[PDB]
Structures are given as structure tokens and as C-alpha cells.
């Protein structure tokens, strides 16, 4: 007897009855959609509700909704330029504790030549025409006019007079649109080769003191949503926000929610600060790429890093990221880039590293989580790689998708049960054969390794304590990336 | 909507599922045309699990405004002297018990009317209406196989071992038959530990 | 039967529950990172306080942090020219009588 | 050797429950009899014998 649905066994009308069953229809597993959620900050005049997840499909729309010049708008623009297919969500955080002022630019001196002046603020480049025999006040006025002409700058600038005996010197006071621990921006001069400043102008940047506080992600997490949310960017890098995210991501990582996530962040600072952060976090659901002297702010790098990682791991999870490039991301200036030893030490701390290709393009050396020790004090490589986390998440998704579709409502029985050919009965042997078939499926896909050990260690058994349950203990033996390659010649002369 | 409408639709779908297959779990069936509770007023996973422990059945509100059944359970949690007994937790259990009793009553009242039972050593003829304990035992085993092909009784060897059909030593004209139900169970919860090897 | 970690046993809700465990997840042993600590002496500038371990990464940084022409500056310069891959730590010893 | 064996014991057998060798422990149940630890130690010895 075939186990029917909606065809009563108590029917006697001689008309034929045909049934369409949606089970046992999809083969393989559907590729998951790329969901990325950025916990950015929105400045004033933003028309979007803070602490509410909003979908955004264009950079201009994100800027209009999240406040023009807010760091979340810039993060969204970078992400969308680096990735289009991925479905993108964003949650603004309003504003946090800390002064709104960033610093001052002292542009003093008297024009000696007839060149040009370039100022790089938050990565964005600003050009001012320098006229021969011109004072510094005029150049400061032109520079502040240029700054106001570019809405995308996270900081707005106002001109302030000398307030002294001198006349050429003048100040440009910056003020971040969003108030947070990342309100401070990086200001430099003559970044790209071939650019230079005229002899007369003396450029300096007086950074205002004070460490601002990141806004608390409390209402943001309490209304984050229930979707998959594959990747969760986090520009904030202070202890309490990341601890809250740790609690949420460990709750999600558990078997009671089944939804997986990953927290991609970036830190820009001194090598010691990056190393201490990496050795202190110790969370195997979060990854960071430390940078030093970054012309752009941290969150702009974080957006592109998440975009590239999401695309490259949704295409193939176990595939490494040794060569994937970050498009349009400005590298640190030469002499401040991490050397080989520094990058290897960072990889052994927990902080991911990057390589700058010839020409200035930035590439991903090795992106890893913060897992460096077991529950004991000893070291652990089980969750070291981001590829391991992505592959495990995909494996759980695949197994859940197949199980909840092929066996929606069936009847478990012992292995030696003589049920009908088409009857909907699941036995430990049936589940073992099904799991072996699915294992061969993703092995042909290329996400796993040796099949003999998986077949030998696959254990499916009825729970003797409580019925209506199957206990499954398997060993996948994940496939491993190419990583390093060491060879000894041992030449014979 | 008022409660009785939900009760009517749930009974309709439950009758459908249990008559088509008594031991089929009612996990993914939907209540057709019944408005679910509004969002923010639905029991979460923890509340649903706690209610299932307490004895009240649950229900899931899948996407598309559809109302599913989740786990139909009977309000049976306490044994005779306190304790905790799951032998009647699933509505499938009581439904399959009723179906088995129905089938056995039909078969016994049809195949064995006006017969004459006797001890197993009786030298009864081929056509003569005599049913020894061995004969009725083999008939019960074959009948058990008859509703084993269509699931519903899980094991067989333990059933054959524990099947005890005896002549009633006191008085006469009744077979004392004691059989382990060996009822099948429904695939409700899947527990899997990945234990990746790397 | 099986002891499942972080999976709530004694549950009724019909769904699928899957958990990852690191037991039997490492083969061989992880490569131990080599770490070298030196008990050297510092003077002159000596920006770093004595008896304070400092993760030093270059000879120039050692000279600017432990004073030019000090025991630890020369020792770290000699070490890092021989083994860059190792993780290095220096502890100044102040002054000797 | 001490480093490797400490790592192996602290990772492979956390929250287990040891028992006498004749115990009737299940396949997946967390039980480590002296024989199980002996075989695991021999396999690990081979692992740093290759």
C-alpha cells in the first residue's frame, strides 16, 4: 500500500484519483541566498527609524534613508559597489556618547609656487588650486568650500580664523556627522605618487583628544529579525557590543535556532592594539582584519571585506580566499605595511592579514576567526579557518534542507521491518543509506573528503530513553584548503 | 475567530490524516481557511515545548498565513500512582490502538464464528471447525503480518516471542490472549551531532 | 544513548536539531608557536619600564624602546636577524650595581 | 610530547565518564574505559611515530 495524502481509504466513487506530492522532488540542495546585515550608524536628518532592519538596493537610496554622509550610507555604497547579487540589510544605531568634533587642520604658510594641494580625509581625496603668491587663509577657504561641496564626507568642516598675530595661518575644524568611537577620521597629504604640496604651505593635523563611546546594540539585536542573516558586519569593536553579539551568535549557532551567522569586522590602529584585541576576543564566530594607518576608516574596509567574503564563500564555501581582491580599497602607505613576520604573527594571534598587490590593489592573505584555544588553555585549530565555519554552516543547512523535505511526517521503525515498498517508513538503515547518498552528493560537489570513514563512523540509532527520535553521530572529515606548500628539492648531482 | 471553528477544522484534518493512515504523524498538515493569531501574540519555541510537556497540543504558523498542526498529543501525563507515562502521549498511539482493535474484532468475528476450540493435541480434521491455541496463534501472527505490510506494528520477532495465547484453565470457551502491542512510532524529532573531523 | 552536548534532551517539538562539536576534530597536534624570552639589560633612554615584558618586533623599535646601544637592543637585533618567524619577548632588567 | 598529549586529552575527552573495562557502554555514549584510553594512546603514539 502506497502511503497516500488527501486520498481517503474510505472512498468508493469509481472516478480515478491522482495526487501530486511535493516530497522527494528537489535533488541536491538549493544554493543559499547571500544575506548580509550591517550594524552601521546614521547621522542627523536621517529618515529611517533607528534600530530597525531595512533593506536597501542602491547606494543613493541608502544615503537618502540613512542620512546623507552617515557611516552606514558609506558602508552600504562600498558593499553594493563590491557586491550586487547579495541581499543586503542594514540596522542604524542612531548616535552614541562622545563629542562630535574630530580635529583641526592647520594650513599655514605663503604660496611659493603655482601647484595644487591634495588633502585626503576619510580616504576621499580633495583638490585645491594653489595660486602663486597666495596666503593660507584663501587656501583654507577654498578647502572648506571643497569639503562642503562633497556631501559623502562623514565629517563637515568649518573655517576658523588665526586667533593670533599671524595672518597666513588658519584652521579648518572638522565635525563628524555621526557621533561614535569611529567619529575620528584620518587626514593625510599627498598620498598617491606624483602628487606633492607647494613649498609655501605648511600642513598639519591637530587631532582633538577624547575617546568616544560606541552606541549600545541593544534595541538593534532585540529587533534584528529571524531571517538567515548569513553575515553580520560590525564596525564597532568595543568589548560590550561584541559581547552582546557573541551571546546572540552563540544562541543562533546552537541547535535550537539552526540559523548560522558570522561577524566580519576591521580594526585600524597600532600593531600592539590589534594584537591585544586578537588575543583577547577569542570568539570562533567573529573575524577581523587588522590594518595600520588606513587612509579610509575601518568600516569602509569592513564593508568591502564582507562583500568579497560573502560572494567568494557562497560560490564555494571550502574554497579559500588567498587571492580574492578588495576592489577600490586604498592600501596603507609604503613603510607602514606589515612585513612577512608581522603578518605571520598576526595570523597566529587571531587577526586576519592582507597582502597589497603590485599597483596598490589589496588582497586577502588569510581571513580567520578568533579561535585560538580550546576550553582548556591548549591551542585548537578546529575552528581556526573561516572556511571551516562556512563549510560547517553549509553542511548543516544542506542536511536540514534534505531531512525536512524528504521526511516531513514519517514513521520510524527498527531496521528489520517489513513495511510496504511505497509506505512512508523510516528505519535506521533507511536513514543511513539516505545520509550516505547525500554525503556522496556533496563529495561530488567537492565540500568533503574520504567516504570510507564516513560510512564506517555513521551511527543512526533510536533513542532508548524517549521514542520518536533518531540520534545521529557522523564524521564528515571536511575538505581542507591548499594553504601553504613546502617542498624540498634534494637534488642529486 | 472563535474557538469552536478551529476545533471543527482541526478535527476534520485530524480525521482525514488518521483515517488515511492511523500512525502517520500530523506534523505538516494545515488548517484550511482559518485565520492565525496576529504576530507578536504567538507562542515561541520555548512556550510550545512547555505546553507540549503540560499536555496541551501545539500548532505552527508557517509563512503565507497558514496554520499547521505541529504535534497533536493527548492530555495524558500522569500514571496511576503519580509517575509519568508516555504510552498515550501521541494521538497516533490511541488511534492505532483503536484501529488494531477494530481490525482484530472484524477478523475474529468473521473468520471464527461457530467454531469449536480444543487443546493443541486434538486430532481435528482438515475441514472440521476446530481452533487450537496453536491455530489461533498462527492466525494471529499472519494477521499481524497483514497489518505489518502497512506499517503500524514496527517489530515482529518480539511480538512472536511475547505472544501468549492460552486456553483458560478455569472455566471454558475463552482464549486468554496477551500480546505486546509493539506499536510503531512517528518520526518526530531528528537529533544529529556533526562532530566534524577536519 | 549518545551524550549530545548543548542539545536539549527531553524535548517534544517536531523539528530537526543539529549541533557541531570539536571532540575528535583535530588530527595529530597543532604546530606549537615558538616563543623566546630574553632577560636583558636596558639603559640611557629606556622608554619601557624595567621588569616589563615587551613584544619587540624590530631592531629599530628595540633601540627606540630599550635605549640605543643597550644589552637588549643588541640582543634583539642579533636574534631577529637570525629568526624572524619566532615570537619574541624582551624584559629589561634596569641597572646593575 | 607532553604538549601534544595534553592537547589530545583536553580536546578528545572533555566531560566524558570513565568506567571499568567490562562496562556495557554504547557506541556514542561518552565512556572511556582503561582499554579505550590504552588504544587511543597507542594510536596517538603511532601519530607521533610516523
Amino acid at each position: 500500500d502506497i502511503s497516500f495524502n488527501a486520498i481517503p481509504s474510505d472512498v468508493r466513487v469509481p472516478l480515478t484519483y491522482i495526487e501530486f506530492d511535493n516530497s522527494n522532488a528537489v535533488s541536491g540542495t538549493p544554493a543559499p541566498r547571500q544575506r548580509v546585515l550591517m550594524f552601521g550608524q546614521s547621522g542627523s536628518k536621517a529618515s529611517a527609524a533607528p534600530n530597525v532592519p531595512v533593506r536597501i538596493r542602491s547606494g543613493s537610496q541608502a544615503s537618502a534613508a540613512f542620512g546623507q554622509g552617515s557611516m552606514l550610507a558609506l558602508m552600504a555604497d562600498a558593499f553594493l559597489n563590491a557586491n550586487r547579487v547579495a541581499e543586503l540589510w542594514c540596522i542604524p544605531q542612531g548616535n552614541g556618547t562622545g563629542n562630535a568634533a574630530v580635529g583641526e587642520i592647520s594650513l599655514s604658510g605663503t604660496a611659493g609656487e603655482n601647484g595644487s594641494l591634495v588633502t585626503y580625509i576619510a580616504g576621499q581625496r580633495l583638490a585645491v588650486s594653489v595660486a602663486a603668491g597666495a596666503t593660507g587663509a584663501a587656501l583654507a577657504d577654498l578647502l572648506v568650500a571643497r569639503i562642503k561641496g562633497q556631501p559623502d564626507l562623514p565629517v563637515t568642516a568649518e573655517v576658523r580664523a588665526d586667533s593670533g598675530d599671524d595672518d597666513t595661518h588658519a584652521d579648518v575644524v572638522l565635525s563628524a556627522k555621526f557621533t561614535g568611537a569611529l567619529s575620528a577620521v584620518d587626514v593625510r597629504w599627498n598620498y598617491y605618487a606624483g602628487e606633492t604640496t607647494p613649498y609655501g604651505i605648511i600642513t598639519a593635523f591637530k587631532a582633538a583628544s577624547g575617546k568616544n563611546g560606541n552606541p549600545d546594540i541593544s534595541a538593534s539585536i532585540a529587533g534584528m529579525g529571524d531571517l538567515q542573516y548569513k553575515y553580520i558586519v560590525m564596525p564597532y569593536t568595543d568589548e560590550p557590543n561584541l559581547n552582546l553579539l557573541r551571546t546572540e551568535l552563540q544562541e543562533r549557532w546552537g541547535p535550537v535556532n539552526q540559523a548560522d551567522g558570522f561577524a566580519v569586522t576591521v580594526l585600524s590602529g597600532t600593531y600592539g592594539d590589534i594584537s591585544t584585541f586578537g588575543v583577547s576576543r577569542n570568539d570562533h564566530l567573529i573575524s577581523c582584519m587588522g590594518i595600520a594607518g588606513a587612509p579610509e576608516p575601518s568600516y569602509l574596509y569592513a564593508a568591502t571585506l564582507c562583500a568579497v567574503a560573502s560572494q567568494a564563500l557562497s560560490i564555494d564555501p571550502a574554497r579559500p580566499l588567498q587571492t580574492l581582491t578588495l576592489p577600490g580599497r586604498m592600501p596603507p602607505a609604503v613603510g607602514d605595511r606589515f612585513t612577512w613576520s608581522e603578518r605571520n604573527a598576526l595570523l597566529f594571534d587571531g587577526i586576519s592579514t592582507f597582502n597589497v598587490n603590485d599597483g596598490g590593489e589589496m588582497q586577502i592573505e588569510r581571513m580567520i576567526t578568533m579561535y585560538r584555544t580550546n576550553k582548556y588553555g591548549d591551542s585548537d585549530p578546529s575552528y581556526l579557518n573561516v572556511n571551516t565555519i562556512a563549510t560547517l554552516s553549509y553542511l548543516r543547512y544542506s542536511l536540514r534542507t534534505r531531512i525536512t523535505q524528504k521526511f516531513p511526517n514519517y514513521k520510524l521503525a527498527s531496521d528489520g521491518t517489513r513495511f510496504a515498498t511505497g509506505q512512508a517508513v523510516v528505519t535506521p538503515s533507511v536513514i543511513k543509506t539516505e545520509l550516505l547518498a547525500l554525503f556522496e552528493e556533496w563529495e561530488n560537489a567537492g565540500l568533503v573528503e574520504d567516504f570510507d570513514t564516513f560510512k564506517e563512523e555513521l551511527y543512526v540509532a533510536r533513542n532508548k530513553d524517549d521514542k520518536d527520535r533518531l540520534d545521529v553521530l557522523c564524521g564528515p572529515n571536511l575538505i581542507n584548503q591548499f594553504r601553504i606548500f613546502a617542498a624540498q628539492v634534494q637534488f642529486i648531482l
Side-chain angles (χ1 to χ4, degrees), chain A residues 222-245:
Chain A
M224 182 179 72
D226 207 1
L227 277 81
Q228 182 66 219
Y229 282 127
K230 269 298 185 260
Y231 278 68
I232 306 185
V233 186
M234 185 64 72
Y236 314 131
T237 50
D238 50 347
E239 210 80 37
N241 296 295
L242 302 160
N243 277 120
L244 265 293
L245 195 67

Side-chain angles (χ1 to χ4, degrees), chain A residues 116-293:
Chain A
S116 64
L117 180 78
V118 298
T119 74
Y120 293 62
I121 304 179
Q124 309 207 46
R125 173 205 197 236
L126 295 173
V128 179
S129 65
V130 178
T135 187
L139 268 75
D141 285 330
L142 299 188
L143 175 60
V144 74
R146 195 63 209 81
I147 295 181
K148 291 183 183 292
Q150 197 142 353
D152 291 331
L153 266 295
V155 298
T156 184
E158 69 165 70
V159 65
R160 186 181 72 182
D162 191 295
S163 76
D165 296 339
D166 192 11
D167 272 334
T168 74
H169 168 236
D171 284 15
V172 183
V173 179
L174 315 182
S175 53
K177 292 181 179 181
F178 61 98
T179 78
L182 294 190
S183 296
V185 300
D186 189 77
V187 170
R188 57 176 67 235
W189 270 271
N190 304 133
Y191 176 59
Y192 299 122
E195 283 175 345
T196 179
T197 183
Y199 178 61
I201 297 90
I202 300 302
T203 62
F205 173 83
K206 324 293 209 215
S209 59
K211 184 61 162 153
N212 306 319
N214 284 304
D216 63 323
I217 45 167
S218 61
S220 175
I221 282 153
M224 182 179 72
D226 207 1
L227 277 81
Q228 182 66 219
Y229 282 127
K230 269 298 185 260
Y231 278 68
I232 306 185
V233 186
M234 185 64 72
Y236 314 131
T237 50
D238 50 347
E239 210 80 37
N241 296 295
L242 302 160
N243 277 120
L244 265 293
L245 195 67
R246 179 180 291 172
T247 62
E248 210 68 27
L249 274 188
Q250 286 202 2
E251 204 282 346
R252 278 202 163 192
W253 185 255
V256 294
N257 205 358
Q258 295 287 115
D260 312 342
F262 201 67
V264 168
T265 81
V266 175
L267 283 72
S268 62
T270 307
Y271 191 96
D273 294 359
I274 313 303
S275 63
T276 50
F277 184 82
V279 298
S280 63
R281 284 301 330 171
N282 190 11
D283 201 357
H284 62 87
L285 272 300
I286 194 165
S287 177
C288 300
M289 211 198 314
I291 319 181

Side-chain angles (χ1 to χ4, degrees), chain A residues 305-389:
Chain A
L305 167 55
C306 182
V308 171
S310 182
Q311 189 74 287
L313 294 179
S314 172
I315 281 289
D316 204 358
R319 193 179 180 89
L321 298 93
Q322 303 175 125
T323 300
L324 277 296
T325 186
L326 307 190
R329 280 309 103 188
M330 281 215 288
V334 287
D336 186 74
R337 299 170 175 179
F338 306 144
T339 79
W340 188 89
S341 72
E342 304 188 331
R343 274 186 285 112
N344 184 57
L346 282 196
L347 289 173
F348 273 119
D349 293 358
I351 286 291
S352 162
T353 58
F354 61 95
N355 210 3
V356 296
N357 190 60
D358 308 335
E361 291 266 300
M362 185 180 288
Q363 282 156 14
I364 309 179
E365 197 84 345
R366 261 196 63 173
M367 182 179 72
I368 66 167
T369 70
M370 301 265 188
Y371 204 59
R372 57 191 326 277
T373 183
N374 192 6
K375 292 223 204 312
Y376 202 66
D378 286 357
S379 62
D380 206 317
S382 45
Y383 285 150
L384 168 74
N385 294 313
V386 66
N387 301 292
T388 306
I389 296 301

Side-chain angles (χ1 to χ4, degrees), chain A residues 416-487:
Chain A
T417 302
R418 318 160 70 168
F419 63 104
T421 61
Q423 204 93 38
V425 182
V426 295
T427 76
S429 74
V430 164
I431 294 293
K432 288 177 183 178
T433 64
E434 190 283 338
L435 276 182
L436 289 174
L438 187 50
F439 183 90
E440 303 206 16
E441 202 295 335
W442 61 86
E443 172 192 328
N444 166 64
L447 261 53
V448 77
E449 214 166 6
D450 291 331
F451 168 64
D452 291 331
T453 187
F454 183 81
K455 182 186 269 146
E456 291 189 1
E457 311 313 348
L458 183 64
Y459 182 68
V460 179
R462 303 189 65 184
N463 196 0
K464 66 183 289 290
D465 290 328
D466 294 2
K467 309 315 258 184
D468 295 8
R469 295 185 48 188
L470 280 75
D471 302 326
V472 175
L473 187 141
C474 63
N477 197 319
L478 268 56
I479 187 172
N480 307 288
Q481 308 83 62
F482 184 76
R483 292 279 79 82
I484 75 167
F485 163 64

